Amino acid sequence: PRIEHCSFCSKPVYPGKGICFVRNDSRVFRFCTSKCHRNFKMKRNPRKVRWTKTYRLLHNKDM
Amino acid sequence: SHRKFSCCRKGNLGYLPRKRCTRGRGRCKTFPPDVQGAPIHLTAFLGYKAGCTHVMRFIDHRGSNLHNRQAIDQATIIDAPPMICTAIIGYAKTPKGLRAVTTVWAAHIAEPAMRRFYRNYFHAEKTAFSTYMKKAADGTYIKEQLGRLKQHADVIRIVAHTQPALTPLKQKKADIMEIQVNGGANVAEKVDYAYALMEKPISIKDVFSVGAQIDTISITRGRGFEGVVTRWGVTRLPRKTRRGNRKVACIGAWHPANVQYTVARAGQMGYFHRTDTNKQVFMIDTAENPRCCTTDKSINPVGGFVNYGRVQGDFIMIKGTCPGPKRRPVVMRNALLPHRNCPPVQLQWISTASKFGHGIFETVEERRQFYA
Amino acid sequence: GGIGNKFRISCGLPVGAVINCADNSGAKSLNMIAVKNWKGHLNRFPKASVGDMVLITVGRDGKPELRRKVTPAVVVRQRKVWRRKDGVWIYFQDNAGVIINPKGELKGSSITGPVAKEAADRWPKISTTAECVH
RNA sequence: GACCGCAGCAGGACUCCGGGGUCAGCAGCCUCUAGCGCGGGAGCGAACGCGGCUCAGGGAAGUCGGCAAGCCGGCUCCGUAACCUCGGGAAAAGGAGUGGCUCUGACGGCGCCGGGUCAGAACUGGAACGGACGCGGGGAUCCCGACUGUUUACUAGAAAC
RNA sequence: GAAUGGACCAACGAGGAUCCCACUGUCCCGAGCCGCGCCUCCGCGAGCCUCCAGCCUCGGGAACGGGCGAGGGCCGGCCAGC
RNA sequence: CUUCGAUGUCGGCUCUUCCUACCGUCCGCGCGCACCGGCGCGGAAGCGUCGGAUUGUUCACCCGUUCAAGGGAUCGUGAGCUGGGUUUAGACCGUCGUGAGACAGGUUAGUUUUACCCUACUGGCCCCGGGGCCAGAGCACGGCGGGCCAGUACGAGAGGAACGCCCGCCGCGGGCCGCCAGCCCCGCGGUUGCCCGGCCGGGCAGCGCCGCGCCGCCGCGCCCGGGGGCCCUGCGCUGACCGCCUCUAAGCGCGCACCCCGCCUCGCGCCCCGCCCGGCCGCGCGCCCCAGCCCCGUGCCCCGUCGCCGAGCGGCCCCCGCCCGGGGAGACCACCCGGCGCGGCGCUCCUGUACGGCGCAGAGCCCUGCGAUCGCCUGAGGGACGCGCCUGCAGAGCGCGG
Structure with a gap:
């Protein structure tokens, strides 16, 4: 089907699941779940949350 | 003096008494109109609510904004294993209403039907139908009694029994339901069609069609003794009210001197018979087909249907919601009067992700690649 | 002045809400x-959604001419999440609105920030003026 | 722990002695010693009540009235107005920091041994630090009484005395 | 209306007012939860009331009756709520 | 007049019902009705009559909006609440009084007790098969807009309809949980003080606090609500009385958001069937029409009073377990299920990378001693109340009714 990536988690969100948030900067941040969202609003770096793709990419785990 | 500010009564009084349903499962109460000389068809089927999924659909509704647009809509899967027809009841409409002429049963009734007839099958004496199987099985008895139905009946119905062994339910006793045969050119055409189905399985695929509307009929989820604010929707009083805010402050006026039936009172909320009408069938399919929901994706959610089971076999996805919790029996009838302006179904996706937790994988194999 | 039959969306801004200005009209904050x-029901505060025309007053923050008057406005951004029938659940960082006449003309030349499609479909001038529809 | 109040009544009863840790603390919280398991128990986890929590978006639109709740709060450094009997106001208003480590500095008696406070710096941790606890919300005015005091035990703490 | 004291408010106030900012389930509009009560059981066990009786509608009547006139309902016994 | 050995005393909140003397919506008809609008009238009480500033206020008044009738119910509504008003005792001020005090002048401060009884109502119960059928009782879809019509009829312009069909929305109603928010029972992570010697892992601070969070509830989310009948007020048809005319007098058509019915909610009884298929009882059928009334204005007149067989029809009665365990059900019961379950094993999801080991990490100090942290093994470990399985222990009364 058609998917989007969490702006924070970077894990694919299938149709019908998630929230989209429009920043004043004019960027649109699609979110996987309230946890994908709350981590971002609380300004917690994605590169320090181990489950997040950015940490997996940082550790060389995913790409 | 007057209320001073117009406001409606909270609650429908046609759903009164709000009592726990005495009827065992949802009953059909009325059946779709007979219609003379239509194609011969069966009016209802019994099923068990499995879960809900959410589907992407292409909406061809001209005049709606969503015309040639895409919509994610909730849909309810109801497991419907084939039902064995076991009998044929004919009712003659009389001055006193429909009065049954006779019900003719098959020479062999399966164990789940017999189980319904006894409280504990193991300690039961197992005498039901014992003389009848001997009187039947000669062939002549059934025909002579079916002949009585042809001559003296107008409303021919088939008595069917669900097979609980093909379901994840712990029941073990077959829900027995009468289903009307509608559309015969003559009464004798209905009884003859019924005899073809006697002692034989009937499936949802024959009974209903995709795009058609069905009236779900079921007993609702129960919440037990509940207060007026939850049961009837009355406004909670201000926080400082001594004796609490969760009550109707005046249950009436000095005159009439008795509390009225229309005044909200605390009592049973839930477990009431309710019919939901005009629900369109998104799809009828089998879970044995590996690609039923693929537009491999079969109907089973990854992780299984929460609080339900494996949905093995025939299933129907209706759009929207049905009364009752999961596991509950739902009788499903052809809509008495259908919403004419409903768009035709074009399912483009069905969600198969875990409804247990927030799953992000449609299939177990996708999860296996992800967690390498 | 709204063009079309909007599908119902969750209304996050009740009477008393102070929505921010999305235009260079000169108001900084608008009170609803x-x-x-609105035909209400007893006790229900009137509530509004993105794309819904509201009557607003401009507070002491705004330019003097704008102040002291009930003026028409449309809500263009809401914090409350709402579900479009496509299934998208969308929310914006702030609650903001544009001063516009019921006919549709806007007091200010510019609109700031993303503006919801609901406002832009219902009001054409909103679509042309706004930089982004999200 | 037996007194006095109907009683072996969450009522009222004058003293003496008073460890540790966190702390400015005889505060709160936890404890050593000592005392000790309170007109009973089980089951259930309805409504409703009482004692507490949490709540999206809005933010007093509720109401006689912001009642009740919440907000604020410790310390250190800045930064503080009108008015004013020049004493105040004032913790005005408003900010910023705060942990854990690893170390530096200063401060005495004077071979050598204290003290636990003050600064300053690295380096660290989902963007976290008075981490529980304890613990002003603030401001602009109007009336009245100058104030601190006193008051109808058992419905009026007030502008009354 | 001027020691039946007049006017004047710095500082003080569990005093009486009006507003503003922050703040919140006060409200829109309620929902979920944790204890304890309730509830059921074992054991203990009262108070207060009480001519009788214990369903209504209308009429007439100390002008607003449970009993009276004429209608309409109603096996009998309980429980939790109110 | 009735109540003073006491019927609690305004407004608000909350909640139901009722009326019509109808404001909007509906149906007709009339206008000084071109249209749009207004306005008068008859039927019509189904729905709607809202959010706010001041006031204790009903009222008043103003602002706003889908533009906003009026009332009754012990001036509905205190063992429902509030105490704001009112109306005790404290206290001011003004007037009045020699004074004590007064005020139908203002101001402020001021215990709102009791259900466990009867009734009513709301659910629940008093063991007795499966399917159904219907007496009675309840009852629920209104309003507003957009689009096409249509810038059209109409107006010689400005303006500006309609029927129909379609799409939405509001208010309501009944459900539901896939999403998305709330919430989280004992899950995982973080952290404070004190305690268990330190580490690991814990406990206490009545869930210490914070971050997520499953199942399940939930709304702020989602789904669903399309119909018939008789007909008022009337407009018409044929048509008289009343050598005409006429909707009416016979006759007839159409006809309202109202009413009745359906659908829906409950349901006493009954029905069919199954097990069982057994007794007991009764003895009697033309039809129409009344201005054809087709031959009338009779008959029966004995349910014991001699009638009682059978046949055939019509009846009537009989008949049908619990405990226990779980639940999708629950106060207790009831309901719905039933050789449960308990413990594992997978899957799925929740949290966020376990202890330990390691290091070519680490501000350093200094000394091969310490060091918060760091990466690696490690999307790890821990957890589960959902799904699939059982490889292990188990699990269906000789208990009570019958």
């Missing part, structure tokens, strides 16, 4: 006096 097309 009331909602147009």
